[PDB]
Amino acid sequence: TIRNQLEKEIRVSFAIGGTGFSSVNNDLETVKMNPNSSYTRIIPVKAKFIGKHKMVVSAISKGLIIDSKIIDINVKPKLLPNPRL
Amino acid sequence: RQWQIAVEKGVEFVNGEKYDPNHEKIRLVEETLNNYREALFKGQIDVLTSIYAHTIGGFLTDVLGATNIVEEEIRYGKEVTSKIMGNNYNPQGIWTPEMAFSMKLIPIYYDLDIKYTVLDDKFHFFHAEGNKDSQYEPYMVIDTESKKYITVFFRDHDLSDILGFRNNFYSEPHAWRNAYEFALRVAEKWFDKNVKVLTIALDGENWMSFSVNPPLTAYFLDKMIIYLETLSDNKFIKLSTLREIYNKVPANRILTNIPTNSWLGTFRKWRGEVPQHEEYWIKTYSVYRKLLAYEEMIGGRDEFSNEARWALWHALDSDYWWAEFWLPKIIDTWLSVAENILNNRINKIQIIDVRPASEFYEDEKAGLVVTIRNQLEKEIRVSFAIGGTGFSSVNNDLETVKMNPNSSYTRIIPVKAKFIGKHKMVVSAISKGLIIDSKIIDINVKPKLLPNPRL
Amino acid sequence: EYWIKTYSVYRKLLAYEEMIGGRDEFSNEARWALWHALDSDYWWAEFWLPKIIDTWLSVAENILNNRINKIQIIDVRPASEFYEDEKAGLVVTIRNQLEKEIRVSFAIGGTGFSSVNNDLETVKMNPNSSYTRIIPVKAKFIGKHKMVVSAISKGLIIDSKIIDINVKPKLLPNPRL
């Protein structure tokens, strides 16, 4: 969720980060949010290790990092199903 | 072993009541074990080893893939049997818990000098591929990738289920009539000339204590035993033990594959028939995966890994996972014992320092130091991967180090930045795909400015 | 009509000799009876003598059919439950009542069934014993299927068996939360 507290419609992008997290296909996802409102979107990411993860999301415009946020995600091991009968 | 830990010191129950090794109830435990021991060394009976904590072996090797847990636990169960029986007994046969077989059990059994076993005919024979005549023969099931082999006896599912399940009697001579009927069914198998070895396998106590009137079930047992004696004095059958059959009847037919299965025809009784099975299976899998990571760090086993392995045996016991007797409280109690021994040994490895080994410029190669400290008393092998919103190292999936006890370890890693501004670097340590520790720092990347136009 | 007859009889002999991996007393002593049926003097159009060609083909057609009827298909069952468009298992047992070591092949058939990858699976079994093997198949439709398995040797179908499998739909799982 990106909040816009300005009085104009500003378009900004953000990049994700993390030790194992890898966005499936998005080099830079640009949003376009009108004045005095938020804007939410979902992004596909993929994890590599299991356990206590640190994930960084940073807003970027013209190669410049505006702001960054750190979130915590717990990744669980994928267990295989039963032998079929 | 529960019988043994009562003979030398009395047991105390969780409800409060307790006994002493001189209590007369304990004297009833000692002469039972003495009876079994005397009968075994008289040659009357045969004693099988098994997995110590009764667990579904084919499921663990297939679904979970925890091969190492099964082998050590089988050898522990075998040494317990060899010790409590006494006289340096060496059991050659094993009872596979719940007849949950997998072909990856063949190398485990071969390496432990396990010779024969018992499977099901309805669920393991009709689906087993290879040379077959009938289920009434010892078969030599052989692994193909290792050429290791065991001998297999297939029980008769129907004749076992008829005495195990159809045992609800209502009168004194009713049990006698049913015992005659059951012994009668055994003799009918003799007319068929293909029935060479007849095997019956079932639970020893549950058929007797879960009938509508358990007292008459013991009378049924006496009647059935005395009837089967009259089929051997007329020289119809040769009532013997499985060890004698193993030596007297060599296995000639060769099976090459028996699909994974139990006598229930499914594995859904311990995974699926209770809504909260997957929740606990993921939990026990994470606990075991942490154990593998820790045993990779120190490059083998020690006292703490072995004590976590001990506690992980009891959590995976299939008697608690049974859907009807679902007991999540005891599984949670044993997983916590194993997860605390492992958590107090992995928190000793920290990332104590990460800083730039230079000052950072946009899309210019710089260096970043990482300092790992090892507070264990052992030699550690860790690997760590970095993270960041725009950062990218040259080439490193996992950079592994090798650092000796009570010491630190610093190394410099090269990374590129892609943006300018206020970057956030995440550095995390990994062992066997498990993130051990992670530390976040803050790096300022400055724009790279071109040099003066050359003259 | 009689040329097709004698060609069928000879190609049955070839199939049987492929099964046992060579010649034996039965194959030789039916091959003997095949010589006298192909004699050009009984086929000569003026002295067309079908009642001696039949007499000699019948002798060889009975020596071969009493040695091929000893290879059956004793059971064919699914090793699991069948779902639409999902590789499943099928276990087939072949019995050998001869005193020799037989080599046969079999091909599967059905209205929607299709072997994953097996054009012809040749089993290889020792005397007076069965031999079973699981084969991968893939169902296409849902409902009450009829599936045929036929034993085949040198292009000649030995015996065929029909079974009844029920294929149920594959239903998609829940949205994750």
mmCIF file with all atom_site columns, N, CA, C and O in Angstrom, chain A residues 15-19 49-50 52-54 56 58 60 63-65 68 70 77 79-83 85, chain B residues 59 63-64 265 271 282 285-286 289 385-389 419-420 423-424 428 433-435 438 440:
data_model
loop_
_atom_site.group_PDB
_atom_site.id
_atom_site.type_symbol
_atom_site.label_atom_id
_atom_site.label_alt_id
_atom_site.label_comp_id
_atom_site.label_asym_id
_atom_site.label_entity_id
_atom_site.label_seq_id
_atom_site.pdbx_PDB_ins_code
_atom_site.Cartn_x
_atom_site.Cartn_y
_atom_site.Cartn_z
_atom_site.occupancy
_atom_site.B_iso_or_equiv
_atom_site.pdbx_formal_charge
_atom_site.auth_seq_id
_atom_site.auth_comp_id
_atom_site.auth_asym_id
_atom_site.auth_atom_id
_atom_site.pdbx_PDB_model_num
ATOM 1   N N  . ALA A 1 15  ? 10.662 -1.390  -5.585  1.00 0.00 ? 15  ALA A N  1
ATOM 2   C CA . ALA A 1 15  ? 11.372 -2.644  -5.776  1.00 0.00 ? 15  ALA A CA 1
ATOM 3   C C  . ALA A 1 15  ? 11.418 -3.396  -4.457  1.00 0.00 ? 15  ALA A C  1
ATOM 4   O O  . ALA A 1 15  ? 11.517 -2.788  -3.388  1.00 0.00 ? 15  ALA A O  1
ATOM 5   N N  . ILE A 1 16  ? 11.348 -4.722  -4.539  1.00 0.00 ? 16  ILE A N  1
ATOM 6   C CA . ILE A 1 16  ? 11.362 -5.565  -3.352  1.00 0.00 ? 16  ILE A CA 1
ATOM 7   C C  . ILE A 1 16  ? 12.789 -6.017  -3.082  1.00 0.00 ? 16  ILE A C  1
ATOM 8   O O  . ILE A 1 16  ? 13.667 -5.899  -3.944  1.00 0.00 ? 16  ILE A O  1
ATOM 9   N N  . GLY A 1 17  ? 13.028 -6.534  -1.885  1.00 0.00 ? 17  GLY A N  1
ATOM 10  C CA . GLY A 1 17  ? 14.345 -7.026  -1.531  1.00 0.00 ? 17  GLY A CA 1
ATOM 11  C C  . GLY A 1 17  ? 14.227 -8.018  -0.401  1.00 0.00 ? 17  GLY A C  1
ATOM 12  O O  . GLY A 1 17  ? 13.232 -8.054  0.329   1.00 0.00 ? 17  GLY A O  1
ATOM 13  N N  . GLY A 1 18  ? 15.264 -8.825  -0.265  1.00 0.00 ? 18  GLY A N  1
ATOM 14  C CA . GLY A 1 18  ? 15.270 -9.871  0.732   1.00 0.00 ? 18  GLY A CA 1
ATOM 15  C C  . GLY A 1 18  ? 16.282 -10.935 0.377   1.00 0.00 ? 18  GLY A C  1
ATOM 16  O O  . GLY A 1 18  ? 16.702 -11.077 -0.771  1.00 0.00 ? 18  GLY A O  1
ATOM 17  N N  . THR A 1 19  ? 16.662 -11.691 1.405   1.00 0.00 ? 19  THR A N  1
ATOM 18  C CA . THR A 1 19  ? 17.746 -12.655 1.262   1.00 0.00 ? 19  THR A CA 1
ATOM 19  C C  . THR A 1 19  ? 17.390 -13.776 0.292   1.00 0.00 ? 19  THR A C  1
ATOM 20  O O  . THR A 1 19  ? 18.227 -14.186 -0.521  1.00 0.00 ? 19  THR A O  1
ATOM 21  N N  . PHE A 1 49  ? 14.546 -20.222 0.944   1.00 0.00 ? 49  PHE A N  1
ATOM 22  C CA . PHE A 1 49  ? 14.858 -20.893 2.192   1.00 0.00 ? 49  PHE A CA 1
ATOM 23  C C  . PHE A 1 49  ? 13.614 -20.927 3.074   1.00 0.00 ? 49  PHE A C  1
ATOM 24  O O  . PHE A 1 49  ? 12.579 -20.344 2.753   1.00 0.00 ? 49  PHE A O  1
ATOM 25  N N  . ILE A 1 50  ? 13.718 -21.617 4.204   1.00 0.00 ? 50  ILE A N  1
ATOM 26  C CA . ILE A 1 50  ? 12.639 -21.693 5.179   1.00 0.00 ? 50  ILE A CA 1
ATOM 27  C C  . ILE A 1 50  ? 13.108 -21.048 6.472   1.00 0.00 ? 50  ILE A C  1
ATOM 28  O O  . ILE A 1 50  ? 14.289 -21.129 6.824   1.00 0.00 ? 50  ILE A O  1
ATOM 29  N N  . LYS A 1 52  ? 12.923 -17.661 9.325   1.00 0.00 ? 52  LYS A N  1
ATOM 30  C CA . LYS A 1 52  ? 12.657 -16.278 9.704   1.00 0.00 ? 52  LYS A CA 1
ATOM 31  C C  . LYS A 1 52  ? 13.250 -15.354 8.643   1.00 0.00 ? 52  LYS A C  1
ATOM 32  O O  . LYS A 1 52  ? 14.466 -15.142 8.605   1.00 0.00 ? 52  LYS A O  1
ATOM 33  N N  . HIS A 1 53  ? 12.400 -14.805 7.780   1.00 0.00 ? 53  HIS A N  1
ATOM 34  C CA . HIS A 1 53  ? 12.851 -13.990 6.661   1.00 0.00 ? 53  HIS A CA 1
ATOM 35  C C  . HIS A 1 53  ? 12.683 -12.503 6.952   1.00 0.00 ? 53  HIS A C  1
ATOM 36  O O  . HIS A 1 53  ? 11.759 -12.078 7.644   1.00 0.00 ? 53  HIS A O  1
ATOM 37  N N  . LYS A 1 54  ? 13.589 -11.711 6.385   1.00 0.00 ? 54  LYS A N  1
ATOM 38  C CA . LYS A 1 54  ? 13.504 -10.253 6.391   1.00 0.00 ? 54  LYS A CA 1
ATOM 39  C C  . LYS A 1 54  ? 13.299 -9.809  4.949   1.00 0.00 ? 54  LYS A C  1
ATOM 40  O O  . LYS A 1 54  ? 14.095 -10.152 4.070   1.00 0.00 ? 54  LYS A O  1
ATOM 41  N N  . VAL A 1 56  ? 12.543 -6.485  2.322   1.00 0.00 ? 56  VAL A N  1
ATOM 42  C CA . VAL A 1 56  ? 12.646 -5.038  2.173   1.00 0.00 ? 56  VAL A CA 1
ATOM 43  C C  . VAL A 1 56  ? 11.864 -4.615  0.939   1.00 0.00 ? 56  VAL A C  1
ATOM 44  O O  . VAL A 1 56  ? 12.037 -5.193  -0.140  1.00 0.00 ? 56  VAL A O  1
ATOM 45  N N  . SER A 1 58  ? 11.119 -1.013  -1.150  1.00 0.00 ? 58  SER A N  1
ATOM 46  C CA . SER A 1 58  ? 11.596 0.356   -1.254  1.00 0.00 ? 58  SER A CA 1
ATOM 47  C C  . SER A 1 58  ? 10.997 1.021   -2.480  1.00 0.00 ? 58  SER A C  1
ATOM 48  O O  . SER A 1 58  ? 10.962 0.427   -3.559  1.00 0.00 ? 58  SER A O  1
ATOM 49  N N  . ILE A 1 60  ? 11.028 3.739   -5.463  1.00 0.00 ? 60  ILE A N  1
ATOM 50  C CA . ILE A 1 60  ? 12.116 4.197   -6.317  1.00 0.00 ? 60  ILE A CA 1
ATOM 51  C C  . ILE A 1 60  ? 11.559 5.059   -7.442  1.00 0.00 ? 60  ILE A C  1
ATOM 52  O O  . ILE A 1 60  ? 10.580 4.687   -8.098  1.00 0.00 ? 60  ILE A O  1
ATOM 53  N N  . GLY A 1 63  ? 15.794 6.127   -10.399 1.00 0.00 ? 63  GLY A N  1
ATOM 54  C CA . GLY A 1 63  ? 16.940 5.509   -9.770  1.00 0.00 ? 63  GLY A CA 1
ATOM 55  C C  . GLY A 1 63  ? 17.202 5.949   -8.352  1.00 0.00 ? 63  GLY A C  1
ATOM 56  O O  . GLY A 1 63  ? 18.260 5.620   -7.806  1.00 0.00 ? 63  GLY A O  1
ATOM 57  N N  . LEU A 1 64  ? 16.280 6.684   -7.739  1.00 0.00 ? 64  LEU A N  1
ATOM 58  C CA . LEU A 1 64  ? 16.467 7.209   -6.397  1.00 0.00 ? 64  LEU A CA 1
ATOM 59  C C  . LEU A 1 64  ? 15.484 6.537   -5.454  1.00 0.00 ? 64  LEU A C  1
ATOM 60  O O  . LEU A 1 64  ? 14.283 6.510   -5.726  1.00 0.00 ? 64  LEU A O  1
ATOM 61  N N  . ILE A 1 65  ? 15.995 6.001   -4.349  1.00 0.00 ? 65  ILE A N  1
ATOM 62  C CA . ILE A 1 65  ? 15.137 5.373   -3.353  1.00 0.00 ? 65  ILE A CA 1
ATOM 63  C C  . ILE A 1 65  ? 14.499 6.458   -2.498  1.00 0.00 ? 65  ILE A C  1
ATOM 64  O O  . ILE A 1 65  ? 15.188 7.191   -1.779  1.00 0.00 ? 65  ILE A O  1
ATOM 65  N N  . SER A 1 68  ? 11.868 3.166   2.168   1.00 0.00 ? 68  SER A N  1
ATOM 66  C CA . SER A 1 68  ? 11.960 1.718   2.236   1.00 0.00 ? 68  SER A CA 1
ATOM 67  C C  . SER A 1 68  ? 11.317 1.223   3.520   1.00 0.00 ? 68  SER A C  1
ATOM 68  O O  . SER A 1 68  ? 11.314 1.918   4.540   1.00 0.00 ? 68  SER A O  1
ATOM 69  N N  . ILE A 1 70  ? 10.661 -2.557  5.932   1.00 0.00 ? 70  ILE A N  1
ATOM 70  C CA . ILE A 1 70  ? 11.106 -3.919  6.201   1.00 0.00 ? 70  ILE A CA 1
ATOM 71  C C  . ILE A 1 70  ? 9.932  -4.688  6.789   1.00 0.00 ? 70  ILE A C  1
ATOM 72  O O  . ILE A 1 70  ? 9.309  -4.242  7.760   1.00 0.00 ? 70  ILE A O  1
ATOM 73  N N  . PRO A 1 77  ? 8.098  -25.240 5.199   1.00 0.00 ? 77  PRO A N  1
ATOM 74  C CA . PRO A 1 77  ? 8.534  -26.283 4.264   1.00 0.00 ? 77  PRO A CA 1
ATOM 75  C C  . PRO A 1 77  ? 7.357  -26.948 3.573   1.00 0.00 ? 77  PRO A C  1
ATOM 76  O O  . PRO A 1 77  ? 6.334  -27.252 4.191   1.00 0.00 ? 77  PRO A O  1
ATOM 77  N N  . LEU A 1 79  ? 5.577  -29.959 2.273   1.00 0.00 ? 79  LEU A N  1
ATOM 78  C CA . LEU A 1 79  ? 5.560  -31.390 2.531   1.00 0.00 ? 79  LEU A CA 1
ATOM 79  C C  . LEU A 1 79  ? 4.912  -32.128 1.367   1.00 0.00 ? 79  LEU A C  1
ATOM 80  O O  . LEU A 1 79  ? 3.935  -31.651 0.782   1.00 0.00 ? 79  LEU A O  1
ATOM 81  N N  . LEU A 1 80  ? 5.461  -33.292 1.035   1.00 0.00 ? 80  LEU A N  1
ATOM 82  C CA . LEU A 1 80  ? 4.953  -34.101 -0.061  1.00 0.00 ? 80  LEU A CA 1
ATOM 83  C C  . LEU A 1 80  ? 3.707  -34.862 0.377   1.00 0.00 ? 80  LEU A C  1
ATOM 84  O O  . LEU A 1 80  ? 3.557  -35.219 1.546   1.00 0.00 ? 80  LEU A O  1
ATOM 85  N N  . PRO A 1 81  ? 2.788  -35.127 -0.548  1.00 0.00 ? 81  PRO A N  1
ATOM 86  C CA . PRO A 1 81  ? 1.557  -35.842 -0.199  1.00 0.00 ? 81  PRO A CA 1
ATOM 87  C C  . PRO A 1 81  ? 1.781  -37.335 0.005   1.00 0.00 ? 81  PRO A C  1
ATOM 88  O O  . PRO A 1 81  ? 2.878  -37.866 -0.183  1.00 0.00 ? 81  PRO A O  1
ATOM 89  N N  . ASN A 1 82  ? 0.700  -38.007 0.395   1.00 0.00 ? 82  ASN A N  1
ATOM 90  C CA . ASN A 1 82  ? 0.742  -39.443 0.619   1.00 0.00 ? 82  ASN A CA 1
ATOM 91  C C  . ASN A 1 82  ? 0.979  -40.184 -0.694  1.00 0.00 ? 82  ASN A C  1
ATOM 92  O O  . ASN A 1 82  ? 0.637  -39.683 -1.770  1.00 0.00 ? 82  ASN A O  1
ATOM 93  N N  . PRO A 1 83  ? 1.569  -41.377 -0.638  1.00 0.00 ? 83  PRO A N  1
ATOM 94  C CA . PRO A 1 83  ? 1.469  -42.288 -1.782  1.00 0.00 ? 83  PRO A CA 1
ATOM 95  C C  . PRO A 1 83  ? 0.008  -42.582 -2.072  1.00 0.00 ? 83  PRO A C  1
ATOM 96  O O  . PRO A 1 83  ? -0.761 -42.851 -1.144  1.00 0.00 ? 83  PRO A O  1
ATOM 97  N N  . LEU A 1 85  ? -2.929 -44.348 -2.301  1.00 0.00 ? 85  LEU A N  1
ATOM 98  C CA . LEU A 1 85  ? -3.280 -45.676 -1.806  1.00 0.00 ? 85  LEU A CA 1
ATOM 99  C C  . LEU A 1 85  ? -2.029 -46.528 -1.605  1.00 0.00 ? 85  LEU A C  1
ATOM 100 O O  . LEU A 1 85  ? -1.525 -47.147 -2.541  1.00 0.00 ? 85  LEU A O  1
ATOM 101 N N  . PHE B 2 59  ? 6.054  -44.818 5.009   1.00 0.00 ? 59  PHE B N  1
ATOM 102 C CA . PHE B 2 59  ? 5.634  -43.429 4.928   1.00 0.00 ? 59  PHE B CA 1
ATOM 103 C C  . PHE B 2 59  ? 6.769  -42.457 5.199   1.00 0.00 ? 59  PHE B C  1
ATOM 104 O O  . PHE B 2 59  ? 6.911  -41.469 4.470   1.00 0.00 ? 59  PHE B O  1
ATOM 105 N N  . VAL B 2 63  ? 7.403  -40.134 2.115   1.00 0.00 ? 63  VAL B N  1
ATOM 106 C CA . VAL B 2 63  ? 6.872  -38.783 2.241   1.00 0.00 ? 63  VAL B CA 1
ATOM 107 C C  . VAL B 2 63  ? 7.903  -37.870 2.890   1.00 0.00 ? 63  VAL B C  1
ATOM 108 O O  . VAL B 2 63  ? 8.351  -36.893 2.281   1.00 0.00 ? 63  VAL B O  1
ATOM 109 N N  . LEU B 2 64  ? 8.288  -38.178 4.131   1.00 0.00 ? 64  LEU B N  1
ATOM 110 C CA . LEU B 2 64  ? 9.232  -37.319 4.835   1.00 0.00 ? 64  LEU B CA 1
ATOM 111 C C  . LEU B 2 64  ? 10.660 -37.497 4.339   1.00 0.00 ? 64  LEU B C  1
ATOM 112 O O  . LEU B 2 64  ? 11.431 -36.531 4.344   1.00 0.00 ? 64  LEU B O  1
ATOM 113 N N  . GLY B 2 265 ? -4.477 -50.345 3.416   1.00 0.00 ? 265 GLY B N  1
ATOM 114 C CA . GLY B 2 265 ? -4.668 -49.962 2.035   1.00 0.00 ? 265 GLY B CA 1
ATOM 115 C C  . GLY B 2 265 ? -4.506 -48.489 1.773   1.00 0.00 ? 265 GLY B C  1
ATOM 116 O O  . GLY B 2 265 ? -4.748 -48.036 0.653   1.00 0.00 ? 265 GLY B O  1
ATOM 117 N N  . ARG B 2 271 ? -2.410 -39.533 8.209   1.00 0.00 ? 271 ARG B N  1
ATOM 118 C CA . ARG B 2 271 ? -2.316 -38.235 7.543   1.00 0.00 ? 271 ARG B CA 1
ATOM 119 C C  . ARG B 2 271 ? -3.557 -38.045 6.669   1.00 0.00 ? 271 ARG B C  1
ATOM 120 O O  . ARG B 2 271 ? -3.607 -38.487 5.521   1.00 0.00 ? 271 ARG B O  1
ATOM 121 N N  . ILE B 2 282 ? 3.591  -30.528 9.207   1.00 0.00 ? 282 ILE B N  1
ATOM 122 C CA . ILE B 2 282 ? 4.498  -29.438 8.855   1.00 0.00 ? 282 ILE B CA 1
ATOM 123 C C  . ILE B 2 282 ? 5.366  -29.066 10.049  1.00 0.00 ? 282 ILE B C  1
ATOM 124 O O  . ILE B 2 282 ? 6.557  -28.770 9.902   1.00 0.00 ? 282 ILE B O  1
ATOM 125 N N  . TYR B 2 285 ? 8.003  -31.792 10.617  1.00 0.00 ? 285 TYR B N  1
ATOM 126 C CA . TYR B 2 285 ? 8.955  -31.672 9.523   1.00 0.00 ? 285 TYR B CA 1
ATOM 127 C C  . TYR B 2 285 ? 9.908  -30.503 9.702   1.00 0.00 ? 285 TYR B C  1
ATOM 128 O O  . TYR B 2 285 ? 11.103 -30.654 9.440   1.00 0.00 ? 285 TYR B O  1
ATOM 129 N N  . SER B 2 286 ? 9.409  -29.348 10.145  1.00 0.00 ? 286 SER B N  1
ATOM 130 C CA . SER B 2 286 ? 10.291 -28.229 10.456  1.00 0.00 ? 286 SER B CA 1
ATOM 131 C C  . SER B 2 286 ? 11.260 -28.573 11.580  1.00 0.00 ? 286 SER B C  1
ATOM 132 O O  . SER B 2 286 ? 12.444 -28.219 11.505  1.00 0.00 ? 286 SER B O  1
ATOM 133 N N  . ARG B 2 289 ? 13.887 -30.776 10.141  1.00 0.00 ? 289 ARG B N  1
ATOM 134 C CA . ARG B 2 289 ? 14.698 -30.058 9.171   1.00 0.00 ? 289 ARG B CA 1
ATOM 135 C C  . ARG B 2 289 ? 15.727 -29.181 9.879   1.00 0.00 ? 289 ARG B C  1
ATOM 136 O O  . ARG B 2 289 ? 16.879 -29.070 9.438   1.00 0.00 ? 289 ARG B O  1
ATOM 137 N N  . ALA B 2 385 ? 23.678 -15.719 2.868   1.00 0.00 ? 385 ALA B N  1
ATOM 138 C CA . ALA B 2 385 ? 23.244 -15.030 1.663   1.00 0.00 ? 385 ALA B CA 1
ATOM 139 C C  . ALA B 2 385 ? 22.774 -13.633 2.036   1.00 0.00 ? 385 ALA B C  1
ATOM 140 O O  . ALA B 2 385 ? 22.173 -13.435 3.096   1.00 0.00 ? 385 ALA B O  1
ATOM 141 N N  . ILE B 2 386 ? 23.053 -12.666 1.168   1.00 0.00 ? 386 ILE B N  1
ATOM 142 C CA . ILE B 2 386 ? 22.708 -11.277 1.445   1.00 0.00 ? 386 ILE B CA 1
ATOM 143 C C  . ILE B 2 386 ? 21.393 -10.932 0.761   1.00 0.00 ? 386 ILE B C  1
ATOM 144 O O  . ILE B 2 386 ? 20.925 -11.660 -0.123  1.00 0.00 ? 386 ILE B O  1
ATOM 145 N N  . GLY B 2 387 ? 20.792 -9.824  1.167   1.00 0.00 ? 387 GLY B N  1
ATOM 146 C CA . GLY B 2 387 ? 19.569 -9.365  0.545   1.00 0.00 ? 387 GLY B CA 1
ATOM 147 C C  . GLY B 2 387 ? 19.517 -7.854  0.567   1.00 0.00 ? 387 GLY B C  1
ATOM 148 O O  . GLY B 2 387 ? 20.132 -7.198  1.414   1.00 0.00 ? 387 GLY B O  1
ATOM 149 N N  . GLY B 2 388 ? 18.772 -7.314  -0.383  1.00 0.00 ? 388 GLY B N  1
ATOM 150 C CA . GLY B 2 388 ? 18.651 -5.879  -0.507  1.00 0.00 ? 388 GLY B CA 1
ATOM 151 C C  . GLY B 2 388 ? 17.735 -5.526  -1.659  1.00 0.00 ? 388 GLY B C  1
ATOM 152 O O  . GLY B 2 388 ? 17.452 -6.347  -2.530  1.00 0.00 ? 388 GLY B O  1
ATOM 153 N N  . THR B 2 389 ? 17.280 -4.275  -1.639  1.00 0.00 ? 389 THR B N  1
ATOM 154 C CA . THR B 2 389 ? 16.282 -3.842  -2.610  1.00 0.00 ? 389 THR B CA 1
ATOM 155 C C  . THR B 2 389 ? 16.893 -3.646  -3.993  1.00 0.00 ? 389 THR B C  1
ATOM 156 O O  . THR B 2 389 ? 16.201 -3.795  -5.006  1.00 0.00 ? 389 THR B O  1
ATOM 157 N N  . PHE B 2 419 ? 20.603 1.538   -7.504  1.00 0.00 ? 419 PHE B N  1
ATOM 158 C CA . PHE B 2 419 ? 19.960 2.815   -7.260  1.00 0.00 ? 419 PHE B CA 1
ATOM 159 C C  . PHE B 2 419 ? 20.846 3.671   -6.367  1.00 0.00 ? 419 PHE B C  1
ATOM 160 O O  . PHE B 2 419 ? 21.897 3.239   -5.893  1.00 0.00 ? 419 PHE B O  1
ATOM 161 N N  . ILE B 2 420 ? 20.421 4.908   -6.143  1.00 0.00 ? 420 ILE B N  1
ATOM 162 C CA . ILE B 2 420 ? 21.079 5.807   -5.207  1.00 0.00 ? 420 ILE B CA 1
ATOM 163 C C  . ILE B 2 420 ? 20.075 6.175   -4.128  1.00 0.00 ? 420 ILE B C  1
ATOM 164 O O  . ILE B 2 420 ? 18.864 6.166   -4.366  1.00 0.00 ? 420 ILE B O  1
ATOM 165 N N  . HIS B 2 423 ? 19.755 2.764   1.091   1.00 0.00 ? 423 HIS B N  1
ATOM 166 C CA . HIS B 2 423 ? 19.547 1.340   0.883   1.00 0.00 ? 423 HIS B CA 1
ATOM 167 C C  . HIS B 2 423 ? 19.447 0.597   2.209   1.00 0.00 ? 423 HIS B C  1
ATOM 168 O O  . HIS B 2 423 ? 19.957 1.038   3.239   1.00 0.00 ? 423 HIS B O  1
ATOM 169 N N  . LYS B 2 424 ? 18.788 -0.559  2.168   1.00 0.00 ? 424 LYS B N  1
ATOM 170 C CA . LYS B 2 424 ? 18.681 -1.459  3.316   1.00 0.00 ? 424 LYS B CA 1
ATOM 171 C C  . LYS B 2 424 ? 19.253 -2.813  2.906   1.00 0.00 ? 424 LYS B C  1
ATOM 172 O O  . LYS B 2 424 ? 18.699 -3.489  2.036   1.00 0.00 ? 424 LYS B O  1
ATOM 173 N N  . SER B 2 428 ? 21.818 -12.748 5.904   1.00 0.00 ? 428 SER B N  1
ATOM 174 C CA . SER B 2 428 ? 21.279 -13.863 6.667   1.00 0.00 ? 428 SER B CA 1
ATOM 175 C C  . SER B 2 428 ? 22.140 -15.099 6.479   1.00 0.00 ? 428 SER B C  1
ATOM 176 O O  . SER B 2 428 ? 22.649 -15.343 5.385   1.00 0.00 ? 428 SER B O  1
ATOM 177 N N  . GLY B 2 433 ? 19.478 -25.033 3.777   1.00 0.00 ? 433 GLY B N  1
ATOM 178 C CA . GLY B 2 433 ? 18.300 -24.332 3.323   1.00 0.00 ? 433 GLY B CA 1
ATOM 179 C C  . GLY B 2 433 ? 17.491 -23.683 4.415   1.00 0.00 ? 433 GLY B C  1
ATOM 180 O O  . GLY B 2 433 ? 16.385 -23.207 4.143   1.00 0.00 ? 433 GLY B O  1
ATOM 181 N N  . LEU B 2 434 ? 18.000 -23.655 5.642   1.00 0.00 ? 434 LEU B N  1
ATOM 182 C CA . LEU B 2 434 ? 17.304 -23.061 6.771   1.00 0.00 ? 434 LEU B CA 1
ATOM 183 C C  . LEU B 2 434 ? 18.008 -21.773 7.155   1.00 0.00 ? 434 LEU B C  1
ATOM 184 O O  . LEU B 2 434 ? 19.196 -21.794 7.488   1.00 0.00 ? 434 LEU B O  1
ATOM 185 N N  . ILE B 2 435 ? 17.285 -20.662 7.108   1.00 0.00 ? 435 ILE B N  1
ATOM 186 C CA . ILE B 2 435 ? 17.849 -19.376 7.502   1.00 0.00 ? 435 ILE B CA 1
ATOM 187 C C  . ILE B 2 435 ? 18.078 -19.395 9.006   1.00 0.00 ? 435 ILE B C  1
ATOM 188 O O  . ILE B 2 435 ? 17.137 -19.552 9.789   1.00 0.00 ? 435 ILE B O  1
ATOM 189 N N  . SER B 2 438 ? 19.698 -13.433 10.745  1.00 0.00 ? 438 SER B N  1
ATOM 190 C CA . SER B 2 438 ? 19.665 -12.363 9.760   1.00 0.00 ? 438 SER B CA 1
ATOM 191 C C  . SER B 2 438 ? 19.847 -11.023 10.455  1.00 0.00 ? 438 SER B C  1
ATOM 192 O O  . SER B 2 438 ? 19.355 -10.810 11.566  1.00 0.00 ? 438 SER B O  1
ATOM 193 N N  . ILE B 2 440 ? 20.022 -6.653  9.553   1.00 0.00 ? 440 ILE B N  1
ATOM 194 C CA . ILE B 2 440 ? 19.704 -5.599  8.598   1.00 0.00 ? 440 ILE B CA 1
ATOM 195 C C  . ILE B 2 440 ? 20.589 -4.401  8.908   1.00 0.00 ? 440 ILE B C  1
ATOM 196 O O  . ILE B 2 440 ? 20.674 -3.966  10.063  1.00 0.00 ? 440 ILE B O  1
#
